[PDB]
């Protein structure tokens, strides 16, 4: 009965020649474990929303990906995290941007959705709201990793299978559940050497995250400014819904044509209401995985064959 | 098509019985002067971008509308302001949210567009970036007004003025314009919502939700209950319905404002100009503070029903 999940962990240029297989396998194992968790939840009748929330939570926890633990550093050597989640069944959405004292932004985004009349909260206000609902306050030092610090130092001067450049790491999940509900979630640490207070596409409904039962669930990763300006995630939905494009056609138009034409780089993952799955990326590679409920998953980092 | 400007200063329920004519005239005159200024600029060959920036700046300055001076108060008796500007010719955009120490958020938004490689900046980071560009730091007390303070007090009291009742959320300001060179632009600014949870963001600073412009389709600025405008991507949905669905501006506005948004429990309106110079000011509320005019013609102003 067509339940399916896809996940991503960022996009970038291929650096396989500098990697050992054992290094690559750490990424593959991470992606495999999370997608398999998602598939299991789906086959057991869990909701798309719960599935994308848990998958993004696990991706935040994984230090290899730019969200939560493993977040990139800002120019001030701090971390500012953003996340979004959307329920295609109700069209409700929750989002946080600019948070430093919450371990799992996607769970905070979810709290904004389910435990407030709002869609988006920012900064200390967002944190205070979450703390008032019992979410633990953490120090942002928990997110810090030497790989991302190395990259900050290289960035301000004049280690992974993919080179994200400064902006193209982020994480996300999309799912269609056994009830026909679509959901999407996205989380990020932003961009290496970011001007504090800058916001990219990840937490913005219709830019980095979108879900609607009648069309598509989408999560993006890439150079944020272009994905905002082109409403990348909603554009997929609109092309299909109004233009009558297939998911594949819509993905080609956005990722391979429109975004590049505006100078945007990255990719996205998408599931449509008929259970078609697509993981387009205009970069050389993208950390990714997907699988139908009850089938064996597929993972990838580099080019498709 | 022909150069044209529209503006809004928020939406709401009609509260005429409590007004005198002379009070209403002050609102009509406020709207009229701003739209006239825009028309003049358009006639003089000024850019859509410059026009919508200036109109929204004037609307922020005007204490009657919820943006800049006259901003609503948060739960904590503070002001947190948000703004967006979008250039339809380049598809660049600039936005600030959660700013308290900048007199004119739309000018800060324009600064994000033009003097940073970014599209959106929030809070103190946004403020610091503006200051670094020589923008003046102000104290938020400058925004405070007696009308809005009383609205906060009423919100705080347990149970159930101006020509329109914005309720808590439906006040914002905005402008859309088509210039003599065929460019579309949009800008939106807000003080947010009365008794707001600090850190909450509505549709106004969000590209595609409260503000959108693309020379190939439409310029749009919204005002209403923000959450629904975000979830439905009101501004870009107009563009997408026209561009991909083939709907006229009239059809797209009807679909979004009168059908889709209400179906999600949303209330408010928007202003829109398409690339062919058609202008629409739809609102599913009883009224909307609004005005528009073609360059070289007399403007039209409205508060209550069409
Ligand atoms: Cl690449
Ligand atoms: Cl290589
Ligand atoms: Cl090996
Ligand atoms: Cl909502
Ligand atoms: Cl917790
Ligand atoms: Cl980004
Ligand atoms: Cl297109
Ligand atoms: Cl485009
Ligand atoms: Cl691979
Ligand atoms: Cl009345
Ligand atoms: Cl009277
Ligand atoms: Cl840009
Ligand atoms: Cl200044
Ligand atoms: Cl709002
Ligand atoms: Cl529709
Ligand atoms: Cl009303
Ligand atoms: Cl009347
Ligand atoms: Na992580
Ligand atoms: Na909510
Ligand atoms: Na729909
Ligand atoms: Na990114
Ligand atoms: Na590619
Ligand atoms: Na004002
Ligand atoms: Na910019
Ligand atoms: Na009350
Ligand atoms: Na509003
Ligand atoms: Na286009
Ligand atoms: Na109406």
UniProtKB/Swiss-Prot annotation, chain A:
Pfam families, per the entry: Asparaginase_2 (PF01112)
GO biological process: protein autoprocessing
Source organism phylogeny: Bacteria, Pseudomonadati, Pseudomonadota, Gammaproteobacteria, Enterobacterales
Entry-linked Gene3D superfamilies: (Glycosyl)asparaginase
Description of how the protein assembles with itself and partners: Heterotetramer of two alpha and two beta chains arranged as a dimer of alpha/beta heterodimers.
Positions bearing the site annotation: Cleavage: 169-170
Listed GO MF terms: asparaginase activity; beta-aspartyl-peptidase activity; hydrolase activity
Induction per the UniProt record: Repressed by cysteine, an effect that is attributed to CysB.
SUPFAM superfamilies: N-terminal nucleophile aminohydrolases (Ntn hydrolases) (SSF56235)
Name of the featured protein: Isoaspartyl peptidase
Function: Degrades proteins damaged by L-isoaspartyl residue formation (also known as beta-Asp residues). Degrades L-isoaspartyl-containing di- and maybe also tripeptides. Also has L-asparaginase activity, although this may not be its principal function.
NCBIfam families: PRK10226.1 (NF007589)
Family: Belongs to the Ntn-hydrolase family.
Catalytic activity: Cleavage of a beta-linked Asp residue from the N-terminus of a polypeptide
Organism the protein comes from: Escherichia coli (strain K12)
Gene coding for it: iaaA
Catalytic residues as annotated in Swiss-Prot or TrEMBL: 170 (nucleophile)
